[model samples]
Structures are given as structure tokens and as C-alpha cells.
Target: IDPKQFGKVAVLLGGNSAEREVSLNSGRLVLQGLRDAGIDAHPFDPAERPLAALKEEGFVRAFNALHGGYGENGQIQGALDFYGIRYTGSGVLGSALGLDKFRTKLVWQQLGIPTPPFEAVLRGDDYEARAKEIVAKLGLPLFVKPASIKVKSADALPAALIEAVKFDRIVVVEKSIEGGGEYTACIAGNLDLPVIRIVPQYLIPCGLTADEEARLKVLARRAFDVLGCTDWGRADFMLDADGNPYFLEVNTAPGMTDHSLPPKAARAVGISYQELVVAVLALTL
Candidate 1:
């Protein structure tokens, strides 16, 4: 695709998200990637500059690099909609739904999409009581929230709940699914890139049989599309002791940092990082 077709672009990055530093790192790569691709892209951080200035300065499209908060939660997506500016990733509804773990699982469950068994612990005075109930039912060694604490015992519940509320008012407590290791698959346009297993080492080939990887890739697309996601995003999953993949959550704007999964998955399928970033921005067209 011709870069000129993109017009003047804004690599929307650094925002007031808890993932601010991560977003900054991701945005730097995106900005450079787009520029290296010959696109007239510039850094536009909502925290540092007025969003209205995007329209004012003739930025016709935004390469969304912002992570968490408004950036991934539909606030910025809605604002972009209001301004009639095309950007990357899912629309408002999907963005909001995808960012909320418990809610995302609710929709997935109804559609017969497999997600780990979980419960939500809402923030309130009854938090302690609710935490106990959830812990008893969900059991120990739970994956609680993304500021995630691996609660290995009953005693860890209180502090985990306290920490969870710091990230979101409603904290999601999920049954631990570690038997088959953790993996993520990226969806670019309608294509599901190769699945990557997180060994903390981020393994490509993902150590899955061809059929296993195929099943996960198919599931990834379904989970993503069910949320009405668009352009590019990443779907995370964990397999059970029996090796059944359980959908975790979709990242509408997955990281593009040096250690990011989307690019890694893309690379395994032979797409260069610059090509991947350029292709993402091209989706706005």
C-alpha cells in the first residue's frame, strides 16, 4: 500500500493509563515503524497534547499505540468517532467490553466460547465477605486480576483483593489453568497470526501440534470477532490440564514494544515489524 494514501498520521501514544510507560515504549516503536514505512506519522500523546489538535493539525488518521485506560477502554475510540477520524482496532462497544475481564467472559460464555471458570469481586464494604465467598468457590491458585496475583492460599485473598481494586473496581478471580502453558494469538484484519506461547520467554511455534495451534487460531478469531473487534488485536489463552484452550481476554490495542506478542507472532509468519505496523495503520483505510 502506498504510504501517501494514509495522509498525515498521528501515532497516538502515551496517555494517563496505568500502562503509561509500556504505552510509551510501544508508541516509540510504532512511530518509528510508520515513519520507516514512509508514512507521515507523528507522535500525539493525549497526556501531552490536546486531542482536538489532531484535527487542527490535519492528522487524518491515528495509529493507536495507547494502551489501557481511555486508549483501550473505548473512551478514546468514542472521541475519535466524534471527530470522524478513522483509527485502528475495535469500535467503542468492543473496546469497552474487551477491556473488562468479567464482562468479556460473560459474553463469551453465552456464545459457548470457552473461558476459565471465574467470579467477580465487586468493590464495596462487603468486599471482604465477597472475597471469602469467591475464594471458597473458585478455590486457591487463582489468577486474580491483571495486576494479577497468583493466590496460592486463603491468606493471600485479602491482600490480592485489596491490590485488585487498585486496578479496577470489580476484580475478576479466575481458576488457574496452567497445565498446558499460556499462549496468545494475534488477529490482523481477518488473519490470525501464529500462536505464541508465553514461557516468559515468548515461544514461537508455540510448542503446539499443528492441530492444536490451528484450533487455538480458530478460537482466537472467534473470540475477537464475537466482540466485534476490527483491524488488529491479540487474544490471550490458557490451556487446561486436558489441553483444552480457554480464552482469557482480547487486547484491542496489543503492545508493539520490543517484547510485544503481536509483532512476534507476525514475525514468525514472515511479517516484519515495520510491515506489521504499516499494515495496522492501513486498516484505517
Candidate 2:
């Protein structure tokens, strides 16, 4: 599979989600990356355009650069699957698993990987009771997050999360790890010797802690196998004060911004940004 073989590629972006701006930025960056690499890549914002129309544009392959919601929850992946078009990143099942934090943690637990103990609650249920139960079981200061939040604020967040749980659920929540460094691992192909560990300089920080770094390597390996995630992607996690790591969730198409984790991790393993992009493009070819 030669990256050069994928001529006239489509870089999908800007879905109907809160992360549209980020997705567009990712799409533009990917477009530039592919173009700089001498591939005929075009950025297409899918906010108003239908999938059928994009397929009709005669692209040989799609580079999914969209994030959150419809982009990463397997909708676009399923649409591409229906069209029999090869795209970069995970397939339907992997994308689905990657987007749902609760489901992802369950799989990790089943695979004997460590994840923070959690429970799911509906919007209007006895959230106070649930929070109490969760804290008693998992201890505090426990993190509670909403399943999703289109707009977020300390005041906008549900009272259950603010007064009761101490954190908002719309954002990914976990028991705060004391004295842990943040890191991310990038997996590509069958090569296990080249896992990339990312260390940020507090510019725009998001990496696993020291304990989490070790746990992430193990849990990520298991997640890749369980989800049948071929080619490349990233897994995020955190570590507790006890030096134990808790698996968070996987990112099928992680952000590729200057402050993003995947590209930083890739660089740690000596894979240049262009090389990483080309390598991922080659996977679908």
C-alpha cells in the first residue's frame, strides 16, 4: 500500500458537533500535510454536505479528520463502510467503542485492564444517591461527568455534578491522580517495539501520569486487540496516587493540532509528522 497510490483523497471535516472548529482545524492540517507530501488531498467540510455527495466527489480514499459526536461515533465510518470506501482510522466497531467512555472502560475491565470504577446515570434520576454510592465505592474526590455537553460552564453544569459530585460529566471525569505525569501512546501496525510516550511541557497539557504511563501501555495494547484496531490510533489514561493507572478512552482520529497528543507521541518514536500521516494513509491502501 503506497501512500502515493492514493491520489485525489478527501479530508472530511466539520460535523454537527461542538468540536466542529477543532475538526475543521484538523481537516485543514491534514489537507496541508497530504498536499505537502505530494498527494492530491482536498478538505471538505461535511457540516452541510451529505455523505452521498462526498462519495460522489470521486475521491479514491477518505482521511477522516473530524472529531467528537457524529464523526467519531461510527456514523461516518458506517457510511463509508456502506459505500465500500476505505478510510483512515478505526472501523465501525472500533470507532463506536472509542467514542463511548463507559463502554470502553467495561471492555478494559473485561480484558483484565485497570480502569476507574464507574456507574452510568440518566439525566433526571436519583443522581445524588448515585453519586453517594459511587463515592463510597470508588472514594473521592471522585470525578463525575455528563455523557455529553454541547455548551459547558460551572453554572451550566447540573447541580448534581457541582454540589454533589464535584465535577462535570460532559467532560471526561476521573479520580484526580496526585503526582502523576500525563502521557499518550500511539500504536501502528504489528510492531510492538515502537510505542511512543509523549511528555508535554505544560504548553497545552494532556498526557498520562507516571503510574498512568505504565498502565496505559498495557491497557492500550489490550484495547487495540479487543477492538481489532488495525493501523493506528491513540489511547488516553491517568494514574492514581497509589501508582495505579486507570484506562480512560481511545481516540480513533485524535486531534493533530500543534498541541495534540498523537503527533507528539509519534515524534517521540522518530516518526515525523509527514511520515506519520503517510503511514496512516498507507494503511487503507
Candidate 3:
């Protein structure tokens, strides 16, 4: 693809989200990769500049490196859409749905996809009673993550809910599932790139049976599609003691740092970071 086709691309970064530091790093990597691939890419930190600047500066499309908050919650997508500038990653609806953990699980549950058992805790609800009820139902050590963000124990539930609500109004109290493993599936266009095992960082080739890997890939694709995600993204899941895969969440704007999952998974199949960046942007064409 000609670099000229992607005129003045914007690497959206550094939003005022809780994940701002990560977004800055991810955006820097994306900008470098796009430049290395000969695309006319420039850094555009929403925290530093107004949204209008993206259009005023002549960026035709964007590589959304922004992570949490409006970056992944469809607010930025809606703004970009209103600006009439195409961008990489999922559209507004997908971005919104994917970031929302509770809703994502709900959709997956209805589809019969395996997700960890979860209950939503809205703000103003009886945190103590709700937490106690959740603990009673799901067992000890419930996970009290924001429908958007973590917790470990029953006693920690109240504080966790209080903390989580600072970020998102809805908190998710879920059955904790682990011991088997944690893995992530990367999607580019219609293809599932590769399954990556996460032991601290990442382990390529995932070390699962061929059938297990294929099953994960299929489930990941369905999770991505059901959320209306397009272009490139990632689906993260965990395994139970019996090795059943329980999906965690989908990242519409998956990280792009050197240590990020999407690029690492792509490299398992010989796709260079530059090529992967361009490939994701190419979907906009």
C-alpha cells in the first residue's frame, strides 16, 4: 500500500484516562511503527489538544492508541465519527459495549459463550447487602472489578466497590476462575492472529492442544463479532481448574507497546509491527 494513501494519519494518544500512562507508551510505539512503514503519522494527544485539531491538521484517519475512559468507551469514537474521520479499531457501539465488562458478559452469556459467573453492582445499591449476597452466591473471594476495572476477598468487597465506583458507576462482582491459565486471542480483519498464553507477560504458541487453540480462536472471534468489533482487537480469557475457557473482556484499542499482546501475537505468524500497524490502518481503506 502506498503511504500517500494514508494522508496525515493521527496516532491518538495520552487521554486523561486512568490508563493515560499506558496510552502514552502505546501511542508512541504506534507512531514510530507507522512512520517506519512510511505512513504520514503524527502524535495527537487528546489530553493536550482539542478534537477539532485532528481535522484541522488534515489527518484522514487515526490509529487509536488511547486506552481506557472515553478512548475505549465510544466517546472518542463518536467524536471522531462526527468529525467524519475514519479510524482504526471498533466503531462506537462496539467500543462502548466492549469496555463495559458487565454488559459484555451479559451478551456472551445469552449467546451461550462461557464467561465467569458475574453480578452487576450499581451505585446507590446496598453495597453491604449486595456484597454479602454476591459472596454467598458466588463463594468467597469474589472479583469486584468495575464494569470498566479488581478485588480478591469477601471482606475486600465493600472497599473494592467503593473504589471501582470512582471509575465506573457499575461494578462487577464475579466468580473468580483461575489455576488452568490465562490467554489472549488477537484478531486482525477477519483472521484470529494467534493465541498467546500469559504467564506474567506472554508465551507465544500458547502451548495448548491444536483443538484447544482452535476452540479459543473460534470463541474469540465470536466474542469480537457479537460486540460488533471490526478491524483489529483482542479477546482475553481465563481457564478454570477443569480447563474450561471463561472469557474476561475484549480490548477494542488493545495496547501497542513493545510488551503488548496484539503485536506479540502477530509476530508469532511473522507479521512485523510495522506491517501489523499498516494492516490495521488498511482496514480503514
Candidate 4:
């Protein structure tokens, strides 16, 4: 179908939020991208127009452009969802999940998302050797958390191990991978979605190179298989500055409503959500 057939696309933009300026600029750029991609998109700000007019003016859907508060906290997504209009980005729960770090980690833990190589130092364990051992194996900056007394520096590991043992057996020590960037890959059955390279500051920025993309995709599928994951699994990776990917783990049935990486990948390859879900469901119990 012609992009013109999108039938009055609205680029949702501008909000009275802390990230107002960032949203304003990115909003326009997003609209430009839409237009250049041949969608009949136009700029519209909620502050300037009645959101009801999104339906009144005949917008088929909104490409979310707002940055923070309303855009990120589920206000805009909830509104659009209630209005019977489809918009891009996470739905209410997904948005909220991203905002809560503690809750986010809990979800990741529940989903079996891999973290780092961790060993619990029990009371009987030799503290110094364990500290020196993990330090040598995991390199510097070994992560240690003893029931609560956490340490990020490697040299502090022995003290942390000592402190933690006083409280309880099995103080956990993790080998920290020096990752330059983090990337996520969504796999549907055997297919790998376009890799999302987040430079939090990359394999360098914005997106990964073709080689990295291919590498992550293959690894993502294998990770799921190794983990016994089913359809719609998400595998996260840290691109080692050395160019190898570190294992973190996979999140099965990752939120589909984000519409950022996986959804974009599906659309780019002309796969529908129904197809993606069905493909996974067929393989899983």
C-alpha cells in the first residue's frame, strides 16, 4: 500500500514536561522521518489542540513524539488507548515498569534475564581466596552484595566478603563484564528481529553495525533455546568494548506494546503480531 494510504497520520508532539525542548525537536524530526518515508503525517501537539480533534480531524493513528512525563508515564498511552485510537510506544503497564527500577529488576529476575556470573560465599568458604579468585577471574570491579552491604570496587571485595559473612552465609559475588553498550534482540521462533543498540553510552551509537546485528540475532535465538524459552523471547546483551557479547539472559514474552524495536523489526520484515505470536505459541506449551 502507498504511504499516502495511511490516511491522515498524526505525529504526536510537544508536552508541558521537563523534556519539553527535547520532545519538541525530536517530534519534528520524527514527523520529518515519517513524511520522507512517504506517510501523510502532520504535526499536532496536545497542548495546542483538543486531543478529541485527533479523531475529529481524522487521524488514523499517532506516532508518539512526546519525550518524558506524559509521554513516558502512561498518560498519553492510556488516553490514546481509551479513545479507540492506536498510538506508538509502551502501554500503561510497560511505561510504568520502565519507570520503576526496583520493580523492573524484579520483573527481569522473574523472567530469567541473565545478569552476571555470581557465586555465594558461605561461612565455610575462605574469604580472601574467594575475593582474590573472583577478582582474578572476573577482572577488576567485581560486584559484591552481602545481604545488603554492596561493593562495586574489586579491591573492596575482601572487606565486603568479611562484612557480609558476619551477617549471613553466602554473600554473593558477581563477575562484572566491562560492556561498552547494551543491545536487545527479540526472537519469534527462529527469526531474529532488528537488533536494538542502546548506547548509554555501542557496537558505536543509535544502531549496531551489520555484523553486530547478525551476531546478536543468531546469539539471541540460541540463548532462547538454551534457556528453554518460547515464542516472543527477549535476550539482552552487553557489547564488550572488545566486540564480543556478554551473556545477561532472556526475557520470555517481553512486552509487545513498546513498538520500538521488535514491532519495528516485525513491520520492516512484513510480519504481523498475530503471526509472530502464533509462531511462538505453536512451539510452546
Candidate 5:
């Protein structure tokens, strides 16, 4: 545990992704965490500096705090791979597979586990026809748009469909688990998900059996590995009325913004942000 041995650590921060601003926020906190833990850390934005710069600057390892698609989609991971600089979180394949929601769902489905039914909307297709089809299959209250966008109901499908297409090439339309209790699990180091009830999220009543919690944690950890993610990540789930948990997806680089979920989850369990960040960084070393 010699802090000096972990010299010249790079807290990979901002990037040219939609989540750039969030990345900046996360990076600030993460950079602080590393410094507070007595590790030599510097901020590096992929948008501002070339990946080669990390090698030139002699960064021995990386602490990934980037949150956007660029960071989460394996772009940074791949770049780090080429530089031969070890970083926290999943490698290229894991980030790409996990970030691609459609692919993540496919893997989970093949595992014979329950993930909500979903459709991927590609451009140049008939939005009119496809919208109708998705609505019919998935039913009303579909989440065609990400939380960033506003989509009320199936009545707003057309407008939502066109808007959703504007950002990414594909739009994910998943069958909403109506009345399901939302939850999350953070997999850090160990193959554990630490099942946590998060609907209304961080502030609400929660109920679950010890066995149920164990089941969901196991499901999340399996999903994490199945997606090839390692070191640290988060998995989200939903509970049906029957209380059966449905795996949604895995997050290789969960946000580290001030007031972010990952920090909160860890701290709730008495793991300080500095301690948590150190744990993740130590994984690569």
C-alpha cells in the first residue's frame, strides 16, 4: 500500500461525448479523491489532449471518471490499451458490449434470465410503421426517449421517435415495467452487486427478503461478468409485483459526479468516496 509506487496517475476526465459536462463534474471529484488518498493524480481530458500525451507525460495508470458515450463505449479504454496504460473498469470489449444496451439485453436474454423486451430503432426505417409496431408489442407508457428527453405516452410516439433519432443512430424502446420497484447494485472488486433499492431513489421505503436481495445481487454480478466488465461497475434492475428482479443493463463507468449514485451507494455502506476511488484504482495496479 505504498502510495508513492502508484505514481503519476491520470484521472481520465472530460471527453467529447454528450455527457461531457457530467464527465467534468465526475472528474473533479475523482481527481480530488485520488489526491486525498495520497496518490499523485492529474486531470486529462481526451477532448483536450491526445491519448499519446498520457504516455508522454508518464502516467502509470488511469482512474476512469468519464461518463459519456465516448468514455463508456470503449473509445477511451481502447485508446488506453494502445498506450499500454492500465485503467480502472472494463477493457474495450466489455465497455462496448455493456454500453450497447441492445447487445447487453441480447446477452442477458441468452443467459435465460429476464430483461425487458426491447426494440432498437435504426435510421432510414419507417418511423411511422415501426412506432406503431413497437407500441403494439411493448404497449403504452413506452420509454422511447432517454431520461434527457421528454416523452409522455404512446400518443407522443411519433415526435418522440423523431427526436430520439436525432441523438444516437439507434433508439432503444423498451417495455416499461409498470409499477416495478427500481434498484441498483454496485460491483466493486469482488463479484458482488450489493443489491440496493433505489426507486424514488435514495429516499423512500424499501422492502425485500434477505434471499431476494441475494438473488438480485447474484443476477447483477453475473450480468456484470457476462458483459465482460471487471474491477468496478453498476447494474440496474427492476422488481415486478411478483418481486422477481429484471436485469436492465450494466454500467462499466458509472457516473462519479458530486451527488452521483456510485459514490452514494458506496458511502451508504460506509465506504468513503476517497476509499472507493482508491479501491478502483488499486485494481489496475
Candidate 6:
């Protein structure tokens, strides 16, 4: 039987999140693609309309396109579950784990996967001493990322304020893996397909090698399995000089734009954009 038999699909988009605009773009593209594929598709902007309205409209399935907070973090999935609506992508536990880099890495580490050594600091925590300890243990030339949010600025005040109170700083002071070869692997279905290695045009200043790619694929599979990710997800990692790939984090709601890594990787494995979307849709049913 053809998978397109599933009818009355709703594409969820435009939540009140940092990535709302991008979500709308993704939703529109998917909606158009589904229509072209001869499916009954409707775009549902959650930012403007309530989710309940979509249920009221009798949408049999939901295509999740929202990124960042609410949609990507499992909150939307939870609500969908409560409403007895089947949606695409990872479930609640996987979504929640993938949203938090530090927590995800910890779970990966517990599963015997190689993730970079890191420390999580609470708000108003002693930065100086914590930085010192991290530098001593993991080394300098570290990557200091906000545990909850990604910030951009010349002044550190905004990041610092958010890190101090609202967010945790996942300070990764690991040995600077020189020759940055950073690649992302997009996994769909049951992690049985070839893991497409994403070679971003902008090289990861740290450098990666063939051996590192192999190592990362193994760890990526382990991550996918441990998290119970079914439909689709993306795992990012950086290669070190010793040819070791360290897990960065997983993205439940990977970008779907034309230039997105997941789509690029899917193409590498001979999976067209529409096929990838259809694969995700099939999992919900």
C-alpha cells in the first residue's frame, strides 16, 4: 500500500520560539511538497492559531517543523499525545534529551559513547574557579556554550546574565582537537541505513579524518538507539587530532531548508527530500 494513503495532514509551524520564522519557512515548504505529492495538506501556524483548532479540524497526522524551544523540546509532542494526535519525529523523552546538550552527552557517556568532557555550572556560579578547574582538567581553547540558549554578541553580558540566572553554561574545556573536521549525521527510520557524513563547506576549524568519521558513525548509532529516536534526528560531532570523534549533541528538529545538513545528508544517501518527509510521516502511523 502507498504511504500517501494517510490523509488530512497538518503541518505545525510558527511557534513562539526563537526559530519561529525558520519554522514557518520549513512548514510551507513541506506543505507544498506534500501537496505536490498529492496529499491533503494544511499549514497550521501555532503562533497565530491554537493547536486545538487543528484537532477540531480533524487533522489525522501532524508534520512538526518548529525548531528551538516549545516544538523541539518535547512540549508540543506532549500536548499532541494528550490530544491523541500522531506527529512526526522523536517522542517526548528523546525530544527532551536531544534539546539539552549537556544532558544528552551524559546519557551518551553512560551508554559508553565518547562525548567531550564537560561541566555544567548553575547561575551565579563561580566562573573564575570553574573555568580554572575546567582548563586544568580538560585543557584550554575550549568551547563555552550556553546549556539552554545560544547567544551572539561582542559583549559577554547578555550571555553571562542568561547563564548566571536562567541558563546553565556547558563549558567544554577539552583538548583543542586541531584540524577541525566537523560532520553531522542525519538518521531516519531505524538507524539501518548508511550514515551520511555531512562535510560543511565551512570546515570545522578542528579537523576530521576518515577514522574519526567511522568512530562517529558508531557513536551516533548508539546515541540514536539509547534515545529511542524512531523517525528522524541529527547527531553532530567533531574530530580530534587523534582521530577520535566526540559527540556534541543531537537535534530532534533538524533544519529542513534547502541548505540544511539533514536534507544534504539525506541527498547523499540517495533519499530525496520528499522521500525523507514521507519516511517521517510513515513513522507516525
Q: Mind sharing the TM-score for model 2?
A: 0.79
Compute the lDDT for candidate 5: 0.80
In TM-score terms, candidate 4 sits at 0.52
lDDT by residue for model 3 over 1-285, one digit each (tens)? 999998889999999988999999999999999999888899999898999988888889999999888998899999999999999989999999998888999999999888999889888888888888888878865677777625666777887787777877888888878678888888988645779988867997788888888888988889889988887888899998777889999989988998888888878788898888888999999
Candidate 3 local lDDT, residue 21: 95
Question: For every model shown, what is its TM-score relative to the native structure?
Answer: 0.92, 0.79, 0.92, 0.52, 0.89, 0.84
What's the lDDT of the predicted structure labeled candidate 4?
0.61
Per-residue lDDT for 1-285 in model 4, tens only?
456555677777777877676667656766665666666778898878888998888887776667666766667878888887766544666665444333443444565544555666777787878887777676666655542244666668877787767855556665556756677777765664677665542222226678867866776666555433434446677766776766554443243342445555666667765454333323422
Residue-pair clashes per prediction, in order, are 0, 11, 0, 2, 0, 7
Clashing pairs in 5: none
Worst 10 residues of 6 by lDDT: 149-158
Q: Which runs in model 4 stand beyond 4 Å of their true positions?
A: 116-215, 218-285
Candidate 1 least-lDDT 10 residues: 139-148
Score candidate 2 by lDDT.
Answer: 0.67
Ranking by lDDT: 3, 1, 5, 6, 2, 4
Tens-digit lDDT string for candidate 2 (1-285): 444689779888888888898888888887888888899888877788777766687777898888888788788889888987789888988888777676676677787877767666554456556556555565555455544321122333345454433333333334544455444566765433233434544222243345644555666777665865556677655655554666666778778776666666666557777876777788887
lDDT (Cα) of model 1: 0.85
Model 4: how far residue 263 lies from native, Å: 15
RMSD for all candidates, in order, please: 2.1, 5.0, 2.0, 10.2, 2.6, 4.1
lDDT for each residue of candidate 1 in 1-285, tens digit (9 for 90 to 100): 988999999988899979999999999999999889889999999999988998899889998999888998899999999998899989999898888788889899999999999987766636678768887787768877842278888777878888778867778888888678898888887555888888857897788889988877887889988987876888899987788889998889899998888888888878899988887877789
Q: Comparing 2 and 6 by lDDT, which wins? A: 6
Name every residue pair that clashes in candidate 4: 114-248, 114-249
- State residue 57's C-alpha deviation in candidate 6, in Å: 0.9
The best candidate in terms of lDDT: 3
